Amino acid sequence: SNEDLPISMENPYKEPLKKCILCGKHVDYKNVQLLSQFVSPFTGCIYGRHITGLCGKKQKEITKAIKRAQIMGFMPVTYKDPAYLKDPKVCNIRYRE
Amino acid sequence: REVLQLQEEVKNFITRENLEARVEAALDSRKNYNWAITREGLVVRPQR
Amino acid sequence: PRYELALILKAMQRPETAATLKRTIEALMDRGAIVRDLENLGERALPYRISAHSQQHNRGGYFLVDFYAPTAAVESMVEHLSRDIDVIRGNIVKHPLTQELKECEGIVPVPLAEKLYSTKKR
Amino acid sequence: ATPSLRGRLARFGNPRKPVLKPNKPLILANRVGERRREKGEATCITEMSVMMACWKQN
Amino acid sequence: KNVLKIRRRKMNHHKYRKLVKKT
Amino acid sequence: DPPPSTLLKDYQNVPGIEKVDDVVKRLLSLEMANKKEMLKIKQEQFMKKIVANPEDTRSLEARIIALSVKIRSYEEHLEKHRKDKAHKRYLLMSIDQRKKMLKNLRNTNYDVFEKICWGLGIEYTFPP
Amino acid sequence: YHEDRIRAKFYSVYGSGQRAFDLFNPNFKSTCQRFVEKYTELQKLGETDEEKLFVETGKALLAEGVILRRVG
Amino acid sequence: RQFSYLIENMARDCGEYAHTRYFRGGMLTNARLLFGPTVRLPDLIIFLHTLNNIFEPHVAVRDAAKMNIPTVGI
Amino acid sequence: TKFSIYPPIPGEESSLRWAGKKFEEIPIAHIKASHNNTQIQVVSASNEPLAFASCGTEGFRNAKKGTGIAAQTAGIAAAARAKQKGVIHIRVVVKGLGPGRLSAMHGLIMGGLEVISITDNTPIPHXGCRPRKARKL
Amino acid sequence: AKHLKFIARTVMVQEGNVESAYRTLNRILTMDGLIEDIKHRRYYEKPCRRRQRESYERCRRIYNMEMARKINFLMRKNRADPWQGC
RNA sequence: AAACUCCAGUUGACACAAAAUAGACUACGAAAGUGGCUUUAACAUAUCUGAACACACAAUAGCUAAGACCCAAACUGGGAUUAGAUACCCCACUAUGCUUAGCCCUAAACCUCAACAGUUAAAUCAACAAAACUGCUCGCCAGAACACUACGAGCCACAGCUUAAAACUCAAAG
Ligand code: FES
Ligand SMILES: [K+]
Ligand SMILES: [K+]
Ligand SMILES: [K+]
Ligand SMILES: [Mg+2]
Ligand SMILES: [Mg+2]
Ligand SMILES: [Mg+2]
Numbered sequence A: 001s002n003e004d005l006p007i008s009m010e011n012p013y014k015e016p017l018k019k020c021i022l023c024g025k026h027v028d029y030k031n032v033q034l035l036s037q038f039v040s041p042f043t044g045c046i047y048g049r050h051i052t053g054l055c056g057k058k059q060k061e062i063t064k065a066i067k068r069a070q071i072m073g074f075m076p077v078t079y080k081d082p083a084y085l086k087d088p089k090v091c092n093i094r095y096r097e
Numbered sequence B: 001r002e003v004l005q006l007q008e009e010v011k012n013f014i015t016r017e018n019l020e021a022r023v024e025a026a027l028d029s030r031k032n033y034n035w036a037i038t039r040e041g042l043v044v045r046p047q048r
Numbered sequence C: 001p002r003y004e005l006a007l008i009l010k011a012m013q014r015p016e017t018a019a020t021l022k023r024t025i026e027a028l029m030d031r032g033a034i035v036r037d038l039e040n041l042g043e044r045a046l047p048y049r050i051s052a053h054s055q056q057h058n059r060g061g062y063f064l065v066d067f068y069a070p071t072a073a074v075e076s077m078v079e080h081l082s083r084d085i086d087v088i089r090g091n092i093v094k095h096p097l098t099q100e101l102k103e104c105e106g107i108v109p110v111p112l113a114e115k116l117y118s119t120k121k122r
Numbered sequence D: 001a002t003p004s005l006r007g008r009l010a011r012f013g014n015p016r017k018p019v020l021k022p023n024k025p026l027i028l029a030n031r032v033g034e035r036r037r038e039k040g041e042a043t044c045i046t047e048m049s050v051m052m053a054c055w056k057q058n
Numbered sequence E: 001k002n003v004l005k006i007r008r009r010k011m012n013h014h015k016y017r018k019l020v021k022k023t
Numbered sequence F: 001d002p003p004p005s006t007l008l009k010d011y012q013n014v015p016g017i018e019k020v021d022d023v024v025k026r027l028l029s030l031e032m033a034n035k036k037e038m039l040k041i042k043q044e045q046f047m048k049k050i051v052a053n054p055e056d057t058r059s060l061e062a063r064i065i066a067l068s069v070k071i072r073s074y075e076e077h078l079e080k081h082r083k084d085k086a087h088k089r090y091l092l093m094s095i096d097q098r099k100k101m102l103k104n105l106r107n108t109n110y111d112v113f114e115k116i117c118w119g120l121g122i123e124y125t126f127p128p
Numbered sequence G: 001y002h003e004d005r006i007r008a009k010f011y012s013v014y015g016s017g018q019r020a021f022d023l024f025n026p027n028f029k030s031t032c033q034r035f036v037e038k039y040t041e042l043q044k045l046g047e048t049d050e051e052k053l054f055v056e057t058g059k060a061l062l063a064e065g066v067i068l069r070r071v072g
Numbered sequence H: 001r002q003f004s005y006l007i008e009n010m011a012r013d014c015g016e017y018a019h020t021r022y023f024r025g026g027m028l029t030n031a032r033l034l035f036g037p038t039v040r041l042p043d044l045i046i047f048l049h050t051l052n053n054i055f056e057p058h059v060a061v062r063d064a065a066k067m068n069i070p071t072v073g074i
Numbered sequence I: 001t002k003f004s005i006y007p008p009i010p011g012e013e014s015s016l017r018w019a020g021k022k023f024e025e026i027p028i029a030h031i032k033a034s035h036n037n038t039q040i041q042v043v044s045a046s047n048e049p050l051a052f053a054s055c056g057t058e059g060f061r062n063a064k065k066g067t068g069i070a071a072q073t074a075g076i077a078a079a080a081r082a083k084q085k086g087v088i089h090i091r092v093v094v095k096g097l098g099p100g101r102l103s104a105m106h107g108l109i110m111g112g113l114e115v116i117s118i119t120d121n122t123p124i125p126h127x128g129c130r131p132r133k134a135r136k137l
Numbered sequence J: 001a002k003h004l005k006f007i008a009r010t011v012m013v014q015e016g017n018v019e020s021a022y023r024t025l026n027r028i029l030t031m032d033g034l035i036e037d038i039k040h041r042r043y044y045e046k047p048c049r050r051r052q053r054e055s056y057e058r059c060r061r062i063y064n065m066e067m068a069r070k071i072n073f074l075m076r077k078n079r080a081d082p083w084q085g086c
Numbered sequence K: 001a002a003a004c005u006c007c008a009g010u011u012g013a014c015a016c017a018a019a020a021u022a023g024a025c026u027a028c029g030a031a032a033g034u035g036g037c038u039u040u041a042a043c044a045u046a047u048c049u050g051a052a053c054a055c056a057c058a059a060u061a062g063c064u065a066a067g068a069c070c071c072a073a074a075c076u077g078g079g080a081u082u083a084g085a086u087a088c089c090c091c092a093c094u095a096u097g098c099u100u101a102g103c104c105c106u107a108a109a110c111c112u113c114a115a116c117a118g119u120u121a122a123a124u125c126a127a128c129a130a131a132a133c134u135g136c137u138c139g140c141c142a143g144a145a146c147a148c149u150a151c152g153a154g155c156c157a158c159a160g161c162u163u164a165a166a167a168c169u170c171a172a173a174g
């Protein structure tokens, strides 16, 4: 018949699925430097996923690790350890504007 | 394969014979679990 | 199974710290534990002032003990650590490396929910 | 990103209990709320205080 | 729906408990 | 219960495990494992003793054996935790599901049914 | 279409060609379309490896004077 | 409204009629009152765009069917 | 150097000085901003009381204490007494969301004191004692 | 009580600009939810009332975030009328 | 106003109470319920349906016995308000909220939408609400009120719970 008729395929132009910054990386409660990146510098509050940008699976892991480290004597609760204030900013939040 | 790997790790396990020697070695060494993540998903190990 | 003892020790000199570490490891072995490794995380200022055994501690030596013990040993060891005056805080958790991370493909987009309300003209 | 509405409301397909209980249908209207006037507040309280304080002194 | 049916049952039960207490 | 030195079901048949170090043996034994690992060996022993084909796990007989192992675990848990209503419900439900399995087995295969009752020490009672 | 697999790969490797698409001209051929054409011509020769066939396609265009600046 | 001028010229050129403006209610179902008792309604209505400016069917589509007037439509 | 809103850490070495004194040595002005009163106590870096003033001690009574002007007058009173003892720079630590939360600091500045930092220490229990029941108004 | 003081919720004044410092501090507490949290803690909010408020605040976020998404999508069409007179 | 001044602020020591943020997540459990940390045990069923009562559970309140004391708080007392105020507002303090061991077995226990399987075709379809339906099974309902009542029976319940009528009355109730 005719060879120009559309054929059945999976979308070849489909882009790869997005991945959170922590995708494929183990989150440890001992890694206080990583955990501090997701808490408020002034109040120590854990940031929501809309700020942190983490996936649902990693947001839970970070939350559970922060809570564990804070009660085991590794992480402060009411503020962010000043030693980690100069680490890379990975959270979409602006306090001065 | 797992049993073979385990049989190799047990060689380094702490025992009552090497307990004191292993305790001194631990006091001298330092282990760091801290590292940071960038907005690009790259690990930034600590420089110390 | 495999456990991890997060041991925050009192700020002491090297001879006393060695005695405490050996005493703690011997207690684990006495309860049937196969100690695998001992890691020194270094002495740092505590995140908050911890009051233990009628003493206010502001500094401590952080250590890690990797060991295999029977399930019944965990409760016994927790009791022993509570009675040791050289230990500020002691916690036993299931070793994190035993837990395997499932492979993640990525974030799948969720489309806006549809057909929540009838299409009648209001 | 807008929070999800999948499984949030009590519907026949939804097996779980409802997360949300909107009192009005979650449907965009053709209008927005009117601009609200700012609440009036007393002005020049500080300047009044310094004048009244000096009167007491003098 | 209004609560007129519940209100009638509410008064019945109140008066009943008051009667039982008295007697 | 199986001795604590018993090797795990997964590592029991790997070649050369009888000659490994004593530490490796006890690390791979029941002593260093959770309660569920010992339950698997219990199920294995009952399957070999009673069932004709231990490899077939979909048979009405294997399901009765597996359920009885679970029933026994709940009774041991409930002995320690007396006010655990969640597990008391699971035990009573499990007992009723084994009765239904036994009734279906009694109606279909009596010769095999009698072997289940003997091996597992289950007495079939008729409902009121 | 079958060539969408080629077009998707080309756009990923090289990106949008410098030549701007002129959709007004019905006979306009883009750098990607030229690649598909050469790719198909080399497929008729009897090449069975996509990666090898993709590499050969790029080499033929480079010889013809086409500018193929990879994203890298 | 991008083609209102074009369509009004095309109708005048072929000696026909165009309605590219806001369609007032009752132009077809109430014509004898709007125009006069002896007004003659269209015999054919050609919709070059069948949707109004809120992306809903042009009202005359329904009203043309009420008046039994055949309609051509893109 | 760029201005850092974050306070200097006591352990680390900083170049910021106020009258030759480090951040850890500046006296502290504790402001308790309640719904019905504002209390201001100026203490030294070693917790030695220097001055105290509240809306009640300034002659305001009943609902007149819970006003901005009443708190501002209390701030000026505390500043006057604190300046006699040698206080110039103060670290403000406010507690509560009362009407005199900001006015108290304005009074302290109007009294001749310089505020170098503002700390909020309003108590927030993390789960705590159950508060009084809601009012039926 | 146990933590080090003068690290949490502390803001430094720039060039004696206390007004801007208080606004910054007040903005930090609002963005974190402390201001709104403190006010709700004055009186006990019963669980059913807290669940009823959370449901209300969540339905309002979804509506407001969808209306804003439509405003920004249609703002392009605020242009002047191109076919004026047609 | 009363109350407090054996008060208040700073600093230090300091629970058998309650568990910010995360949570814009929507998971777990039969439901009731479950959101601080750790560990142990642990989440029935390879067809489905299947009970007011059998079997086992079941928020809060409440009962019995022994403990705990931060805060909250029926009742009660004081202050205020009011024509009165046995309320709404303020203060103080109980039972109670907690733990242990037994009861009691109720809820707008409602997501007022039963379990399992399947459909989106046509007249979709009273109205509103959360679109309209098919197969199959158990449970339940036949005007309002009397009536979450009387009597009988069962129950660790004894001012209780479950089951649950009739007479007279009306032409409506919904
Ligand atoms: S997207 Fe892979 S773990 Fe977050
Ligand atoms: K908490
Ligand atoms: K009921
Ligand atoms: K309901
Ligand atoms: Mg409603
Ligand atoms: Mg209403
Ligand atoms: Mg009545």
Ligand SMILES: [Mg+2]
Binding pocket: none
């Ligand atoms: Mg008085």
Ligand SMILES: [Mg+2]
Binding pocket: K023
């Ligand atoms: Mg929350």
Ligand SMILES: [Mg+2]
Binding pocket: none
């Ligand atoms: Mg059933």
Ligand SMILES: [Mg+2]
Binding pocket: K051
């Ligand atoms: Mg029945």
Ligand SMILES: [Mg+2]
Binding pocket: none
């Ligand atoms: Mg109960």
Ligand SMILES: [Mg+2]
Binding pocket: none
């Ligand atoms: Mg009780």
Ligand SMILES: [Mg+2]
Binding pocket: none
């Ligand atoms: Mg009280």
Ligand SMILES: [Mg+2]
Binding pocket: none
């Ligand atoms: Mg009491």
Ligand SMILES: [Mg+2]
Binding pocket: K098
């Ligand atoms: Mg408690």
Ligand SMILES: [Mg+2]
Binding pocket: K109
């Ligand atoms: Mg409920």
Ligand SMILES: [Mg+2]
Binding pocket: K114, K115, K138
């Ligand atoms: Mg049913």
Ligand SMILES: [Mg+2]
Binding pocket: K148
């Ligand atoms: Mg009742």
Ligand SMILES: [Mg+2]
Binding pocket: none
């Ligand atoms: Mg009764």
Ligand SMILES: [Mg+2]
Binding pocket: none
């Ligand atoms: Mg009776």
